[PDB]
């Protein structure tokens, strides 16, 4: 069951949108996914049935990214109107709104323990917040440019960040700098425990780095040596994530194609007719055999895995 790979046709193609897509994620517990957008909206569809449930409004500008707590009740979202909004997924209404970011927020991430939230914005600063209160407890800095995305490790101790500076910075709540990239680093993803054994024979912690240089590079977190580099993408990479079993890597780029990479053999295994326009982001369901991709093409297609 660690080997179900996406295959066409898309299970469902949800185009009930009036603007591009920015992020998509599965709800951790309930069988629902959500999608962000530039039209200051967050949309809630059931991937198991493909029926429209509701829409979440309240942001005023482009929703840059969305994250979920481990519990599945607290929902976080950020947009370009400087605000990070916390949403009760049970009640469907903004519990509280956040202020303090000087310029555009690209991503936020609820920490796994579900007590704080960390954010990345264009002021070249990383801010960590108290979810329950909205007080800014601390602010990490050192980045030179727009921090395009930030992601915490599974235990919350280490948080990784990428920016236009082409340097992936990591620090423990600069432990390592990864500056050898040929272009901007677009997206990152911590490696799961399932890939620890696979990576060991392929050559911790272990970390990814997806970049606009048409390459995807795997890394050693402690020492910062580039473990390898996948090659074959024809355009800017926008999302990299591991399989549930840690054996594969599912990645998307602006080459209108979704590729499946066998990093053991250091090669692309499968490629899908992703979308007519550029592929915005992806996500892989932890347990169920469903994967989703929402594109700048005003559609949110769901691939089934065989």
């Amino acid at each position: 069951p660690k080997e179900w790979i996406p295959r066409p046709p898309e299970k469902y193609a949800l185009s009930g949108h009036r603007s591009p897509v920015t992020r998509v994620i599965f709800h951790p517990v309930f069988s629902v996914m959500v999608s962000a957008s530039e039209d200051a909206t967050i949309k809630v569809w059931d991937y198991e049935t493909g029926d429209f449930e509701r829409t979440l409004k309240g942001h005023t500008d482009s929703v840059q990214d969305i994250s979920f707590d481990h519990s599945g009740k607290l929902l976080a979202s950020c947009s370009a109107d400087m605000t990070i909004k916390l949403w009760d997924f049970q009640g469907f209404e903004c519990i509280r709104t956040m202020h303090g970011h000087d310029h555009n927020v690209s991503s936020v991430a609820i920490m796994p323990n579900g007590d704080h939230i960390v954010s990345a914005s264009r002021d070249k600063t990383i801010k960590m917040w108290e979810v329950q209160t909205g007080y800014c407890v601390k602010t990490f800095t050192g980045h030179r440019e727009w921090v395009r995305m930030v992601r915490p490790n599974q235990d919350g101790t280490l948080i990784a960040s990428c920016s236009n500076d082409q340097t992936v910075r990591v620090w423990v709540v600069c432990k390592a700098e990864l500056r050898e990239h040929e272009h901007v680093v677009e997206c990152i993803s911590w490696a799961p425990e399932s890939s620890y054994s696979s990576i060991s024979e392929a050559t911790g912690p272990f970390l990814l780095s997806g970049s606009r240089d048409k390459t995807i590079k795997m890394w050693d977190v402690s020492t910062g040596m580039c473990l390898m580099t996948l090659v074959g993408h024809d355009n800017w990479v926008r999302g990299v994530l591991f399989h549930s079993g840690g054996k594969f890597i599912l990645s998307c780029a602006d080459d209108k194609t979704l590729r499946v990479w066998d990093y053991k053999n250091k090669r692309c295994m499968k490629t899908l007719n992703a979308h007519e326009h550029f592929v915005t982001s992806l996500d892989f369901h932890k347990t169920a055999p469903y994967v989703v991709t929402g594109s700048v093409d005003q559609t949110v297609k769901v691939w089934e895995c065989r």
Binding site: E93, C94, I95, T97, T133
Partner: peptide
Amino acid sequence: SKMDLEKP
């Protein structure tokens, strides 16, 4: 309690 009447 559900309303966002919080002002830091």
